[PDB]
Design a protein around this nucleic acid. Sequence first.
RNA 1: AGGGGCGUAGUUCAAUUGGUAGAGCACCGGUCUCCAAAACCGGGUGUUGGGAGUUCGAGUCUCUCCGCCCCUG
RNA 2: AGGGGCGUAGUUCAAGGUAGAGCACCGGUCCAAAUGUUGGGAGUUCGAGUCUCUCCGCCCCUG
Lengths: 334, 311
Amino acid sequence: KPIVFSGAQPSGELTIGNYMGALRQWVNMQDDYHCIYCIVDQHAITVRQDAQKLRKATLDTLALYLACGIDPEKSTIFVQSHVPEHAQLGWALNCYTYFGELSRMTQFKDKAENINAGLFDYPVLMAADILLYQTNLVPVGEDQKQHLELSRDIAQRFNALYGEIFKVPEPFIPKSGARVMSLLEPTKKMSKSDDNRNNVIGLLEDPKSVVKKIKRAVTDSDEPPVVRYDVQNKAGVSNLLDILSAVTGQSIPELEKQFEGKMYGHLKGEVADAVSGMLTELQERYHRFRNDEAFLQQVMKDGAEKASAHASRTLKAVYEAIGFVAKRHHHHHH
Amino acid sequence: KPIVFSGAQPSGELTIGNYMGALRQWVNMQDDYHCIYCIVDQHAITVRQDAQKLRKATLDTLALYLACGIDPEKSTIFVQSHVPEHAQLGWALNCYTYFGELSRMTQFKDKSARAENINAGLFDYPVLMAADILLYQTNLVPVGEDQKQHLELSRDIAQRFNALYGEIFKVPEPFIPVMSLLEPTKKMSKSDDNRNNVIGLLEDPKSVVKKIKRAVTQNKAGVSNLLDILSAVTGQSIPELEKQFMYGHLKGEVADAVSGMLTELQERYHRFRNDEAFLQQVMKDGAEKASAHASRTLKAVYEAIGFVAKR
RNA sequence: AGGGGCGUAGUUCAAUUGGUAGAGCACCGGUCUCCAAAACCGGGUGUUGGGAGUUCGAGUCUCUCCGCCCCUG
RNA sequence: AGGGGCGUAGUUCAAGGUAGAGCACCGGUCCAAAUGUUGGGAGUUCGAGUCUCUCCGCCCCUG
C-alpha cells in the first residue's frame, strides 16, 4: 500500500475548495492508502503569532480533519512537535541542503520583518517531514512544488552518498475533486491564503455568511439571463455550477436543465442553501470533536505513538549512515 | 552552583595546549561547578567526512575526557545526538534568530567569500550552538577558538526570546579563564593541518621526542614557550627554569617531562577506550541526566511558543 | 561586543525652508445590476513607533526607550 | 521541474600539435628553523585540455 504524507497547517480555515477538491476524496482512500496527516505547528512559528491562538488553532485543525472524516484508526493524525524525530532529522538534512537551493526558493527570495532562520530553513524541515515516513505519495500543496522538488533533491543526494535510506517521494494528483474557483475572480482557483475572504468560504461559516458571499459572486450581463456552462464566457456562472454539482453530485447538463428560465439570484440562493446544508453536518460534527477534550488528547496520544515508531526506524538508519554512535537505550535494546 | 556548558568536537584530536590550558584545571573543579560536556557530533556533520571515523572519534574523544579526569558521576558528559532536545530547540530558536545575524557571521560570510559545502548546516549552526547552551540553564560558557560571536548571538537570542515570553532562559556569560611549535606566534590548536606543529595527548614518547626536536629555536619564543610548557608541566617557574637551564637538554627535558605528564592519562584511556560496556553506560547515564534538564527548559519554551503539549 | 541607520492610513507613497498629514491603489457606501462585475457617484482611513524635550508652531530639530535593518570581529 | 555556466597536481594556476608553473608541503643546525588522472564516457579529427554529445559533481537562475 502506498504511504501518503499530508501536512495540516494549523492556521488557514479550510475552504470548500480544500474539502471538495481534495480532502473529501482522500477521506475515501484510507483503506487503500496509508495516509498520514501531520499538524505542522513547528512550521507555523516561522511567522510570529499569539501563543493561545496557535494552541487553539492546532486543536481546531485537528477536530476539523476529524470532522472532515479522517479516521484515526485507519490514518495517522498527529502534531508535528510531539514527534521529536522531525527536528532531529531536520538538522541532519541541513547538512545535505545547499544555501543557494534554500535562498532561491521563490517565496523566501521574495521576503519583511521576520527574516528568521525558520523562514529560510523551513524547506529542509519540510523535507524531513516527508522523508521520515518513507513517503512515496505527496499531495503537492499550494505554491509548493519547489519544496517537494527540494525534498526529492535532498533524498537523492543522501541516498546517493549512503544508500536507499529513503524513498524518493512522487507528487500526488488524485481524482480531481470539484473545481472551485474564487468567487470574485472565477479565473483563479479558491485559495485558503486569499487575503480577500469574499473569494472564499470556510468550512465553518454561518448559513448567513454562505449566503452573503455567494450573493456577491461575479456573474455576467447576458440578456437574456442564462444558466449554461461556458468557462470562457460565463465563468462565475460556470463556477456556481461546478460548486453545486460537487455538493449534489448532479451533472452539469442536469443542472442546466433544472435552471432553465431561472435567473442568477435564484442560482445563487440555491447554491448557498446547498453549500450551507453540507457544512451543517460537518459543523455539527466538528463541535462534538472540538468539545471532547478527552477524545482530542487521545487522538494525539495514539497518533504520535504511531508516527514516532515509524520515524525512529528511519532516524536510526540515517544516524547510522551518518557516522553517529547510537543512543544507548537499554541493555537489551536492539 | 554555576552551570558550565562546554562542547567537545569529536573529530579534533586534543592537544597538550588544551589540557594544560583548561582541562587539567577543570578536572579539579567538578565539585564547585556544575560542569557539562557535550560531544557535539551534530555540529560535526556540517563538514563531510568518513562516517566510521566519526563514530570512533566520538568515542575516542569521550574516553579521552574520562581519562583526563572527568567524573561521569560528578559532571554530565554525553553525546549531543543522544539528546533530541538539541534539534528540537534548534528548530524553535531558528525562528527567533534573524537571517542577517546569521549571514553576518564571520565564519559564514567568509565561506561565502569564495566555498566547499555552503550548506544550511554551515549557516544554521550557530543557532544550534545556542540551543546547546540555553537548554541546560547554562550560567558560564568557556568561549574559545574564535567563538565569541557565537556566544554573543546566544546571549542575544536568549535576551530576545525572554523579552517576548518570560524569563525562560538564562543569559550565558563568558567564563573568564602554549603556542604552536613551528609558529610560536600562533597558538597550538587542534584545528591545524600540520600535526608536526602540535603534540597530541595520546602521542607516545618516541613520537613526542620526535615532534619537539624540530621545534623552532619573546625573541627566541620557541625557547620561551618550550620553557613555559615545563613551567606548567613541572610546576616550576621561569626564574627557576632560567636558572636550572645545550638547547638539546631543554628539548630532551620537555620530552621526558610532557610524556611523564601523559602517563596516567594514556594508561587510563586504554582501559576506558576498550571497555565499551563502560562507555555504553556513561553515554546512557549522561544522556538520561541531560534530557531530564533539557526537557525541562524545552517544556517551558514549547508552552511559551504556544504549542500544544504532549503526554 | 562594539559601530552605523530606519520607523507615516490596509498597502504603495507625499507633505518645499519648521506653519494647517495628503494622494494612488485597495476598501467602503451610493447609483447600478435578477443577482454580481463593470461603470459612474461619493466616503473613510493614520499610535506620523512609544515618551520626553525645543519652539508661538514639530511628520520635519534634540533626547530617550522599543523593534527591526545594515557593519565589524 | 526546467534553463545557463564551471571542473586541470595538495592548492591557485598556465597552455586543435603532442600538459608548464607558483605556493604548499616532503629531500639534502647543540637543536630548530632560514607532481599529470586535464571530472567520466563516447565521438569528430592525421592529431583533442581545446570541438560535439552524454553522464557525474557543484555554482547561477525561474515558479
